Design a protein around this ligand. Structure first.
Ligand SMILES: *C(=C)CNC(=O)[C@H](CC(N)=O)NC(C)=O
Ligand SMILES: *C(=C)CNC(=O)[C@H](CC(N)=O)NC(C)=O
Lengths: 304, 304
């Protein structure tokens, strides 16, 4: 029993973190096989970041200008290329700790673990969600660029995020491991405002299911609703619309608890309209939306 | 910027987890050098747990009755002893991934990372606090016994917790790595009720400091207080008394922010008396107490 915001064990990713230095910029890289992946703004000064022409800046860089350090041992860079907003540094040594991996581009509402790193060294691990506005609310200080987000399926690390940017509002933006930003963000120090940070409805409902499973039941009401009626309330509270796809995904939690998904929607509707009245659910005074239905099943079943 | 409930990177501890089986009971063990540490109730049936005599149960067990599996390779047990509520299984092979380590017994209010494990395999990592009533609010399913809590100082793992027990209220109890329970708990399936779960005041104040540092300032008021006046309010709200030792520990966060500790106490006093009025601090609708002053400095400074 108990339900915690839980990250994947980070060891497999710790084994991939390196330091990348280009001139006076140092950030983190991800060493998989004989390639080190890092944000392309490693080639920039803070001055460059105001208006960088990356192709032009890269012309001035050779293999020997990229200093890659894995622990306290230097890797030899034998090639470099830009893919979208990442650099791929080819090194002469395959990372011996390379886990089975994939590169995945996640959808908004999907959760992942971040291994916060500085100078190629892990500082901490925490659980994030891709917000509906394609930001993440992370903990990223100067030097954290190139820290990665990931999911693990048994022995396979799916890398979904690399950290690039803090917006002036202090929310975070980054790329998948092909270098494509999530959302409309660019790797430039300019005015970039996030859209509406809506609540990930399917994730709130999953977490209400987790609550019932762990004995927090006070919010369960006598009502049901429809998707259309629920969605009217959801829109009013800046919640994402719930689709039949979301209802289908919640099916196993519905089955386990014997609470129809639309009944849990009606409970959620009353919590939106009535508030918590100073009560908590799983030790929270607000409705948690950074657990996916898959997260709740995993944590409630003990998957390793 | 951003402030997250952050666990230590778990790789160093992942490298220590093994499966221990005795008859039909399987749980987790911690393999450090040539010793595997696990809860002594590995020798119990669920029937035994109602009223176990551990010394008597252990007489019936030989080295070959303890099955220790590290990955999918069996370790040879060459000795066993009971220390308090843990078994120490001497094995013929030193764990080659043994990190620098220490065993520490933490105080209430101290935070630590848990690596939740099943069948010797890590499922997740999360951040916990030793509650003032010597429980932790964890996420622990059947099979999680022997999962450990730890802090890391650069390269040295300080193990502070091993999981033994879920109380009927669904909060958790366990031992240090010498086998001594935190609090009054015993490894028996009997009526064990927790005392008052008070709020860790020094940790709330640390987190209010983290909030100011990350730009959440709305709760900062025009007032100051004294320790004695604050403590009267703290008692009324089931907050731990604040001591001058706590004020001293908050000194560096006081210095960084320029907010006197007693001024932040007066802000906290108003939040207790007035509530949040539907506002959030660092994305929380309640006052967070599972960040120590050391945690806040570490996360705000980027220690690796
Ligand atoms: C993202 C991490 C960009 N890096 C930085 O701004 C700092 C400053 C620098 N000298 O590169 N890097 C570190 C390691 O603090
Ligand atoms: C604490 C983990 C005690 N272990 C258990 O109760 C279960 C049941 C068993 N067969 O040992 N262990 C597991 C691995 O589920």
């Amino acid at each position: 029993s108990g339900f915690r915001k839980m990250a994947f064990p980070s060891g497999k990713v710790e084994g991939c973190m390196v330091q990348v230095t280009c001139g006076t910029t140092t950030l983190n890289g991800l060493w998989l096989d004989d390639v080190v992946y890092c944000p392309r703004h490693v080639i920039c000064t803070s001055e460059d970041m105001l208006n960088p022409n990356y192709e032009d800046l890269l012309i001035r860089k050779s293999n020997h200008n990229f200093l890659v350090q894995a622990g306290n041992v230097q890797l030899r860079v034998i090639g470099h290329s830009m893919q979208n907003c990442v650099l791929k540094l080819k090194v002469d040594t395959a990372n011996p700790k390379t886990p089975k991996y994939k590169f995945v581009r996640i959808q908004p509402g999907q959760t992942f673990s971040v291994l916060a790193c500085y100078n190629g060294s892990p500082s901490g691990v925490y659980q994030c969600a891709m917000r509906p506005n394609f930001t993440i609310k992370g903990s990223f200080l100067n030097g954290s660029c190139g820290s990665v987000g990931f999911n693990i399926d048994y022995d396979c690390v799916s890398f979904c995020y690399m950290h690039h940017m803090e917006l002036p509002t202090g929310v975070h933006a980054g790329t998948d491991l092909e270098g494509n930003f999530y959302g409309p963000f660019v790797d430039r120090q300019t005015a970039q405002a996030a859209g509406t940070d809506t609540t990930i409805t399917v994730n709130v409902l999953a977490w209400l299911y987790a609550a019932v499973i762990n004995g927090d039941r006070w919010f369960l009401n006598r009502f049901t609703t429809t998707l259309n009626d629920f969605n009217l309330v959801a829109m009013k509270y800046n919640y994402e619309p719930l689709t039949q796809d979301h209802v289908d995904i919640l099916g196993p939690l519905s089955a386990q608890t014997g609470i129809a998904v639309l009944d849990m929607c009606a409970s959620l509707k009353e919590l939106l309209q009535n508030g918590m009245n100073g009560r908590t659910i799983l030790g929270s005074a607000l409705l948690e939306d950074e657990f996916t239905p898959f997260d709740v099943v995993r944590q409630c079943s003990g998957v390793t």
